[PDB]
Amino acid sequence: TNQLQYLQKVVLKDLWKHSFSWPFQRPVDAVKLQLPDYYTIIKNPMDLNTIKKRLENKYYAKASECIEDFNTMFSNCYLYNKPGDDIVLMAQALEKLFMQKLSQMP
Ligand SMILES: Cc1sc2c(c1C)C(c1ccc(Cl)cc1)=N[C@@H](CC(=O)OC(C)(C)C)c1[nH]nc(C)[n+]1-2
C-alpha cells in the first residue's frame, strides 16, 4: 500500500495526463471502432480506467499485480496492431514514461 499509492497518485496520474493516453483511457469499444475480432484476439483486455477502478476499490493484493495489468495493456496493443502503427508508437512512448516512473518507486 506504500507502492500501490505511488502507482495511483503518481504513475497512473502521469500516464493519464499524457496526451498519448486517450486510446487507453477506456476499454476498446469494438462496435464503435468496428473491430469484431478484437475481444477474440485479446483475451485479457486491460485499460487505464480498469486499472484505476481497481486501485480505487482495492482489488490488488500487491504492487506487482498492478504492474502486470499495465504491461498487459501495452502487450495487448502490440499483439492486435502492427509495428509502425500510430497506436503502437503511442503505446511505446507511454511504456517508456511508465518504466521511467517505476524506476523511482518506493
Ligand atoms: C479509441 C481507440 S482504442 C484503440 C484505438 C482507438 C482509436 C486505435 C487507434 C488509436 C490512435 C490512432 Cl492515432 C490510431 C488507432 N487503434 C485500435 C486498433 C484499430 O485499428 O482501430 C481502428 C480501426 C484504427 C479504429 C486499438 N488497439 N488498441 C487500442 C487501445 N486501440
Numbering used by the authors: 29 to 134
Per the authors:
The mode of binding of (+)-JQ1 to BRDT(1) was established by X-ray crystallography at high-resolution. Structural studies of BRDT(1) bound to JQ1 reveal ligand-receptor shape complementarity and complete occlusion of the acetyl-lysine recognition cavity. The observed, extraordinary shape complementarity between (+)-JQ1 and BRDT(1) explains the increased potency of (+)-JQ1 compared to the physiologic H4Kac4 ligand. In addition, (+)-JQ1 engages all surface residues analogous to those on murine BRDT(1) mediating molecular recognition of H4K5ac8ac (Morinière et al., 2009). Notable examples include a hydrogen bond linking the triazole ring and the evolutionarily conserved asparagine (Asn109), as well as extensive hydrophobic contacts with the ZA and BC loop regions. Biochemical and crystallographic studies confirm that occupancy of the BRDT acetyl-lysine binding pocket by JQ1 prevents recognition of acetylated histone H4. Dose-ranging studies of (+)-JQ1 demonstrated potent inhibition of H4Kac4 binding with a half-maximum inhibitory concentration (IC50) value of 10 nM for murine BRDT(1) and 11 nM for human BRDT(1). Binding free energies and dissociation constants (KD) determined by ITC for each bromodomain of human and murine BRDT confirm potent, specific (ratio 1:1) interactions with all domains (KD = 44–190 nM). Protein sequence alignment of human BRD4(1) to human BRDT(1) reveals 81% identity and 89% similarity, including all surface residues predicted to contact (+)-JQ1. Structural and sequence comparisons of BRDT(1) and BRD4(1) reveal differences in surface residues that may be explored to develop further isoform-selective BET inhibitors.
